[PDB]
Design a binder for this molecule. Structure first.
Ligand SMILES: Nc1ncnc2c1ncn2[C@@H]1O[C@H](COP(=O)(O)OP(=O)(O)O)[C@@H](O)[C@H]1O
Ligand SMILES: Nc1ncnc2c1ncn2[C@@H]1O[C@H](COP(=O)(O)OP(=O)(O)O)[C@@H](O)[C@H]1O
Lengths: 396, 396
C-alpha cells in the first residue's frame, strides 16, 4: 500500500497574526458598523487559515437582517472582497462575521491526511475535504452520506475537490474492498487515473457507454440485494462479516443462488453533460440508484457546473441529502443546491460549504489543494502494485 | 396478546424545573422583547417535557405580527435554537411563546401506553403519538381520521414515529381484528416487521409489486362494498357488530362459505415519493381512488415522506386525506404545502411533530414518543412466538 508520505511537504506558514492587529481590525469593524445604522461590539476573535471569524454581539434592538442586508458595503469599506455573516451560532447569542485575510495560508492535503481522524477512520471510503474555519480537519464518511452533490461555477475549485475525494479513497482501501467507476464527459481531468487497479471500466468518455455503465450499476444493485436476501443479512458490512467468519471457521460458504464484495463508488465529473446528451433515462437511473443503494455499497459523487433547476432536478434532490457548494453565481443558485442562502459569499479556490447529512447549519470547509505531482505519484504507485482488472460486461 | 410490560421502563425524570428559574426566564423574556419595539408582561408559565409555553399578555395596541416577524431574533437573544409563537390561544387574551428547555426529556413509550385513555380505548386501531406540550398523552384513533400524511426532512424523527404508530397497532389488536399491509421502498426500517401474523403481503420492495398491492387494495375495497351492500349494513364496524350478534345467538350466516369478522386493513406506505418517482401517476390515481372510499371499508393509509414538495403532495392526495402529521420541515413553503398553513418550520426535530386534527383545528403540538430498535425486535419476536404467519397469494 502506498504510504501517505508520498505527498508534498508542509509549509513554513504565515502564522501568529498579532493580537494588536486583531484589536485594530476589531475596532475597525466596530467603527465601520457604527458608521451605518447598526451598533455592535466585538466579543471574541477566532483566527483561522483562510478567514477569521469575528463573533460580534449586536446591540439591544438591532436585528440580524440589519447586519445581513449590508454585507456588500461591510466588505467594501473594510477593503476586502466579500464578507460572510453567519446569522446564528449554535449555543451563544452572537452573530458571526467572517472576514478573509490578506495572505491566504493555503491548506495542504498531507496536513489533512496526517490527522488523528483520518488515520483512525474505520471505514473503507472516507473523504478528506480540508480544514474548517478554525483549522481542524473535517473527514466525514462517504458511506454515511450516502451520496454527494458538488456544484459551483467555473474556477471555484471543483475538479481539485473531486481529485481530493478520489485520493481520499485511494490512500486507504485495497481494490478488493473498494472499487471506482469514473464517468468523465469532459475528458480533461479524470483521464489521469487511466489504468489504476481500483477501476471496473475504462474511464468513460462517451455517453451511451456511460448509460451502459449506469444500467450495469442498477443490475449490480439488484443482484446484490438478491444475494443479501439469499444470505440473510441487511447491508454490505454484515455480509462481509459473514464471508469473513465463513473463511475463518474451517470451510467457506460457497456461491448461493463468494468473497468480500467491494464497495463500488461511481463518480461523475459533470452530470450536467449527461443530462444534456443522453436524456431523461440518465435522470431515472440516477434516481433509482440513489433511491436504494445505501445498503448495497454503491455511492455517487455527482459534480456539476450549473446549479440550476435544469441540471439539478427534484428527483436528484429527493434521494441525495449531502451537498457540497463552492462559490456559485448568486442566491438563486444557492437556493437551488443548498435549498438556502449563503453559498454566494465564498471566495473560490476550494472554499466550500459542507452541508452535513441530515438537517443543520452548513459547515464552512476550505478545500485542500492537490497537485498533478501528487496525483501522478499516487496513480503510478497504484499501477505498480496492481493491474487493470476490467470486467467489460459493464459497457456491453 | 403481548403484555404491556415488555417495553423498556420510564427513565428517572429530570424534574424540579424550579420556579426561580422560570421567573428569571420570564423577566429575561420581558427585557429581551422590551429591547425591540414591543412591550409585554409575562402572564403565566406552562412547563413541559421539551418546550415551555409562556402565556404573555401584550400591551395596548401592539399586534401579533410584530411578535412573529422577529422569532429568529428573539430566539437568538435567548441562547436557544428556535422559538415558536402561538399567534392565538383559544379562550384567552394571551399569546403563546414557547421556548425549548435546557435539558431535553426523552419521551418514554411505556409511559405513553400506561395512560388511562389507551387501556380504556374502544377502537381496534388506536395510535399513541406522545405527550403534548404539557405532559398530557395524546392518543388518537385512526379510524376517525381516516388517513394520515407524515412529512419532515431527513434526520427529523419520522421513522421512529412510524414505528410508534405500528407498535400502537401491535399492542392491542389480535390479527383477526386488525391487519397490516406494509410497503417500504427501502430496506431501512420496515424489514424488521417481517414475520408477524399481522402482515398480508411480505414487506414490499418492488414498486411494481407495490402498485399491484394497491390495486389489490382497490379490489378488496370494492368487494367489501359489494358484500356490505349485500348485507345491507353500511360501515365495516356495523358489519362486524351484525355478524357478532348473529354468531352470538347460535344463528350462522351465509355469504351471498360461512361469514367471519372482517379485519381493519391498514396499508402503510413508508416513503411514497420514491414510489411515484419509480412508477408514476398510476400510483397517485390509485391512492386517490383508495382514499376517496376507504373510510367505510376499513382500509386505512399511513402515508409518509421526507419531501413535502408540490410534485409529491399534490391536491389529489390532500383532497381525501385531512389528517396531517408535520415534523420539522425546512421553511414556510413546505409547511404551507402539507399543513396548508405556516408554523411547522419552528419545530426542534428529534421527533417533535404538529398533529393537525381532522377538520377545523389549530394544530396540536405533540412530542413523538421514542421507541428503540431493541423493543421492536422484542415485539416482533414476541409475535413470532405467539402466532403463525398467514399470507395471501392473490395480492402481488
Ligand atoms: N485549495 C486551493 N488552493 C489553491 N488553488 C486552488 C485550490 N482549489 C482549486 N484551486 C485552483 O482553482 C482552479 C480551478 O478549479 P477547477 O475545479 O479546475 O475549475 P472548474 O470547476 O471550472 O473545473 C484549479 O486549476 C486550481 O489550480
Ligand atoms: N421521540 C424521540 N426522542 C428523541 N430522539 C428521537 C425521537 N424520535 C427520533 N429521534 C431521533 O431521530 C432519529 C431517527 O430519525 P429518522 O426517523 O430515522 O429520520 P429519517 O427517517 O429521515 O432518517 C433517531 O436517531 C433518534 O435518535
Amino acid at each position: 500500500l502506498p504510504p501517505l508520505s508520498l505527498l508534498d511537504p508542509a509549509e513554513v506558514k504565515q502564522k501568529s497574526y498579532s493580537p494588536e492587529s486583531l484589536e485594530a481590525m476589531s475596532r475597525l469593524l466596530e467603527i465601520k458598523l457604527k458608521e451605518f445604522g447598526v451598533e455592535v461590539s466585538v466579543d471574541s476573535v477566532h483566527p483561522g487559515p483562510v478567514i477569521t471569524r469575528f463573533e460580534i454581539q449586536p446591540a439591544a434592538g438591532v436585528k440580524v437582517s440589519r447586519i445581513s442586508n449590508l454585507a456588500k458595503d461591510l466588505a467594501r469599506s473594510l477593503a476586502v472582497i466579500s464578507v460572510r455573516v453567519v446569522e446564528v451560532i449554535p449555543g451563544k447569542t452572537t452573530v458571526g462575521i467572517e472576514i478573509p485575510n490578506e495572505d491566504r495560508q493555503m491548506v495542504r492535503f498531507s496536513e489533512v491526511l496526517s490527522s488523528p481522524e483520518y488515520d483512525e477512520h474505520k471505514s473503507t471510503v472516507p473523504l478528506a475535504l480540508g480544514h474548517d474555519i478554525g483549522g481542524r480537519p473535517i473527514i466525514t464518511d462517504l458511506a454515511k452520506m450516502p451520496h454527494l452533490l458538488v456544484a459551483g461555477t467555473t474556477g471555484s475549485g471543483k475538479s481539485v475537490g473531486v481529485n481530493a475525494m478520489l485520493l481520499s479513497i485511494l490512500f486507504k482501501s485495497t481494490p478488493s474492498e473498494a472499487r471506482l467507476i469514473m464517468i468523465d464527459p469532459k475528458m480533461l481531468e479524470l483521464s489521469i487515473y487511466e489504468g489504476i487497479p481500483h477501476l471496473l471500466c475504462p474511464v468513460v468518455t462517451d455517453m451511451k457507454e456511460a448509460a451502459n455503465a449506469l444500467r450495469w450499476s442498477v443490475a449490480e444493485m439488484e443482484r446484490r440485494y438478491r444475494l443479501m436476501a439469499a444470505m440473510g443479512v441487511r447491508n454490505l458490512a454484515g455480509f462481509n462479516r459473514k464471508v469473513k467468519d465463513a473463511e475463518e471457521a474451517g470451510t467457506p460458504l460457497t456461491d448461493p443462488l463468494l468473497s468480500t464484495l467491494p464497495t463500488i463508488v461511481v463518480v461523475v465529473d459533470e452530470f450536467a453533460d449527461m443530462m444534456m446528451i443522453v436524456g431523461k433515462k440518465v435522470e431515472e437511473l440516477i434516481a433509482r440508484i440513489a433511491q436504494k443503494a445505501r445498503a448495497a455499497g454503491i455511492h455517487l459523487i455527482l459534480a456539476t457546473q450549473r446549479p440550476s433547476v435544469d441540471v439539478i432536478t427534484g428527483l436528484i434532490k429527493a434521494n441525495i441529502p449531502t451537498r457540497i457548494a463552492f462559490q456559485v453565481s448568486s442566491k438563486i443558485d444557492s437556493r437551488t443546491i443548498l435549498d438556502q442562502g449563503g453559498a454566494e459569499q465564498l471566495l473560490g479556490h476550494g472554499d466550500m460549504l459542507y452541508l452535513p447529512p441530515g438537517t443543520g447549519l452548513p459547515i464552512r470547509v476550505h478545500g485542500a489543494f492537490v497537485s498533478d505531482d501528487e496525483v501522478h505519484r499516487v496513480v503510478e504507485a497504484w499501477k505498480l502494485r496492481g493491474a487493470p482488472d476490467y470486467i467489460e460486461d459493464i459497457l456491453a
